[PDB]
Coordinates of all heavy atoms in Angstrom, one line a residue:
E1 N 0.9 -1.2 0.0 CA 0.0 0.0 0.0 C 0.9 1.2 0.0 O 1.8 1.3 0.8 CB -0.9 0.0 1.2 CG -1.9 -1.1 1.3 CD -3.4 -0.6 1.3 OE1 -3.5 0.7 1.3 OE2 -4.3 -1.4 1.4
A2 N 0.7 2.1 -0.9 CA 1.5 3.3 -1.0 C 0.7 4.5 -1.4 O -0.3 4.4 -2.2 CB 2.7 3.1 -2.0
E3 N 1.1 5.7 -1.0 CA 0.5 6.9 -1.5 C 1.4 8.1 -1.2 O 2.2 8.1 -0.3 CB -0.9 7.1 -0.8 CG -0.9 7.2 0.7 CD -2.3 7.2 1.3 OE1 -3.1 6.4 0.8 OE2 -2.5 7.9 2.3
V4 N 1.2 9.1 -2.1 CA 1.9 10.4 -1.8 C 1.2 11.1 -0.7 O 0.0 11.2 -0.6 CB 1.8 11.2 -3.1 CG1 2.4 12.6 -2.8 CG2 2.6 10.5 -4.2
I5 N 2.1 11.7 0.2 CA 1.6 12.5 1.3 C 2.2 13.9 1.2 O 3.3 14.0 0.7 CB 1.9 11.8 2.7 CG1 3.4 11.5 2.8 CG2 1.1 10.5 2.8 CD1 3.7 11.0 4.2
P6 N 1.5 14.9 1.7 CA 2.1 16.3 1.7 C 3.5 16.3 2.3 O 4.4 16.9 1.7 CB 1.1 17.1 2.3 CG -0.2 16.4 2.1 CD 0.1 15.0 2.2
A7 N 3.6 15.8 3.6 CA 4.9 15.9 4.3 C 5.1 14.7 5.2 O 4.1 14.0 5.5 CB 4.9 17.2 5.2
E8 N 6.3 14.5 5.6 CA 6.6 13.5 6.5 C 6.3 14.0 7.9 O 7.1 14.6 8.6 CB 8.1 13.1 6.5 CG 8.5 12.1 5.4 CD 9.9 11.6 5.5 OE1 10.3 11.3 6.6 OE2 10.7 11.6 4.5
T9 N 5.1 13.8 8.4 CA 4.6 14.3 9.7 C 4.0 13.2 10.4 O 3.5 12.2 9.8 CB 3.6 15.5 9.5 OG1 2.5 15.0 8.8 CG2 4.3 16.6 8.8
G10 N 4.0 13.3 11.7 CA 3.3 12.3 12.6 C 1.8 12.2 12.2 O 1.2 11.1 12.3
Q11 N 1.2 13.3 11.9 CA -0.3 13.3 11.6 C -0.5 12.5 10.3 O -1.5 11.7 10.2 CB -0.9 14.7 11.5 CG -0.9 15.4 12.8 CD -1.8 16.6 12.8 OE1 -2.3 17.1 11.8 NE2 -2.1 17.2 14.0
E12 N 0.3 12.6 9.3 CA 0.2 11.9 8.1 C 0.4 10.4 8.3 O -0.4 9.5 7.9 CB 1.1 12.4 7.0 CG 0.9 13.8 6.5 CD -0.3 13.9 5.6 OE1 -0.9 12.9 5.2 OE2 -0.8 15.1 5.4
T13 N 1.4 10.1 9.1 CA 1.6 8.6 9.5 C 0.5 8.1 10.3 O 0.1 6.9 10.0 CB 2.9 8.5 10.2 OG1 4.0 9.0 9.4 CG2 3.2 7.1 10.6
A14 N -0.1 8.8 11.2 CA -1.2 8.3 12.0 C -2.4 8.1 11.2 O -3.0 7.0 11.4 CB -1.5 9.4 13.1
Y15 N -2.7 9.0 10.3 CA -3.9 8.8 9.5 C -3.8 7.6 8.6 O -4.7 6.8 8.4 CB -4.2 10.1 8.7 CG -5.4 10.0 7.8 CD1 -6.7 10.2 8.4 CD2 -5.3 9.7 6.5 CE1 -7.8 10.2 7.6 CE2 -6.5 9.6 5.7 CZ -7.7 9.9 6.2 OH -8.8 9.8 5.5
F16 N -2.6 7.4 8.0 CA -2.3 6.3 7.1 C -2.5 5.0 7.9 O -3.1 4.0 7.4 CB -0.9 6.4 6.5 CG -0.6 5.3 5.6 CD1 -0.7 5.5 4.2 CD2 -0.2 4.0 6.0 CE1 -0.3 4.5 3.3 CE2 0.1 3.0 5.1 CZ 0.0 3.3 3.8
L17 N -1.9 4.9 9.1 CA -2.1 3.7 9.9 C -3.5 3.4 10.2 O -3.9 2.2 10.2 CB -1.2 3.8 11.2 CG 0.3 3.6 11.1 CD1 1.0 4.1 12.4 CD2 0.5 2.1 10.9
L18 N -4.3 4.4 10.6 CA -5.7 4.2 10.9 C -6.4 3.6 9.6 O -7.2 2.7 9.8 CB -6.4 5.5 11.3 CG -6.0 6.0 12.7 CD1 -6.7 7.3 13.0 CD2 -6.3 5.0 13.8
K19 N -6.1 4.2 8.5 CA -6.7 3.6 7.2 C -6.3 2.2 7.0 O -7.1 1.3 6.8 CB -6.2 4.5 6.0 CG -7.1 5.6 5.7 CD -7.1 6.0 4.2 CE -5.7 6.3 3.7 NZ -5.7 6.7 2.3
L20 N -5.0 1.9 7.1 CA -4.5 0.6 6.9 C -5.1 -0.4 7.8 O -5.5 -1.5 7.4 CB -3.0 0.6 7.0 CG -2.3 -0.8 6.6 CD1 -2.3 -1.0 5.2 CD2 -0.8 -0.7 7.1
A21 N -5.2 0.0 9.1 CA -5.7 -1.0 10.1 C -7.1 -1.3 10.0 O -7.6 -2.3 10.5 CB -5.4 -0.4 11.5
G22 N -7.9 -0.4 9.4 CA -9.3 -0.7 9.1 C -9.6 -1.6 7.9 O -10.7 -2.1 7.8
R23 N -8.6 -1.8 7.1 CA -8.7 -2.5 5.8 C -8.1 -3.9 6.0 O -8.6 -4.9 5.4 CB -8.1 -1.8 4.7 CG -9.0 -0.6 4.2 CD -8.3 0.7 3.8 NE -9.2 1.8 3.5 CZ -9.9 2.4 4.5 NH1 -9.8 2.2 5.7 NH2 -10.8 3.4 4.1
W24 N -7.0 -4.0 6.7 CA -6.3 -5.3 7.0 C -6.1 -5.5 8.5 O -6.1 -4.6 9.3 CB -4.9 -5.3 6.3 CG -5.0 -5.1 4.8 CD1 -4.7 -4.0 4.1 CD2 -5.3 -6.1 3.9 NE1 -4.8 -4.2 2.8 CE2 -5.2 -5.5 2.6 CE3 -5.6 -7.5 3.9 CZ2 -5.5 -6.2 1.4 CZ3 -5.9 -8.2 2.8 CH2 -5.8 -7.5 1.5
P25 N -5.9 -6.8 8.9 CA -5.7 -7.0 10.3 C -4.2 -6.8 10.7 O -3.3 -7.7 10.6 CB -6.0 -8.5 10.5 CG -5.7 -9.1 9.1 CD -6.1 -8.0 8.1
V26 N -3.9 -5.6 11.1 CA -2.6 -5.1 11.4 C -2.3 -5.3 12.9 O -2.9 -4.8 13.8 CB -2.4 -3.6 11.1 CG1 -1.0 -3.2 11.4 CG2 -2.8 -3.4 9.6
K27 N -1.3 -6.2 13.2 CA -0.9 -6.5 14.5 C 0.3 -5.8 15.0 O 0.3 -5.3 16.1 CB -0.8 -8.1 14.7 CG -2.0 -8.9 14.2 CD -3.2 -8.4 15.0 CE -4.5 -9.2 14.5 NZ -4.4 -10.7 14.9
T28 N 1.4 -5.8 14.1 CA 2.6 -5.1 14.5 C 3.1 -4.3 13.3 O 2.8 -4.7 12.1 CB 3.7 -6.1 15.0 OG1 3.9 -7.1 14.0 CG2 3.3 -6.7 16.3

């Protein structure tokens, strides 16, 4: 899974993880 993000920020990483975790069973 990949996408362009505006900046390397904690908020961008957090939002991406939330998206990923709702679509796949993310454990670690």
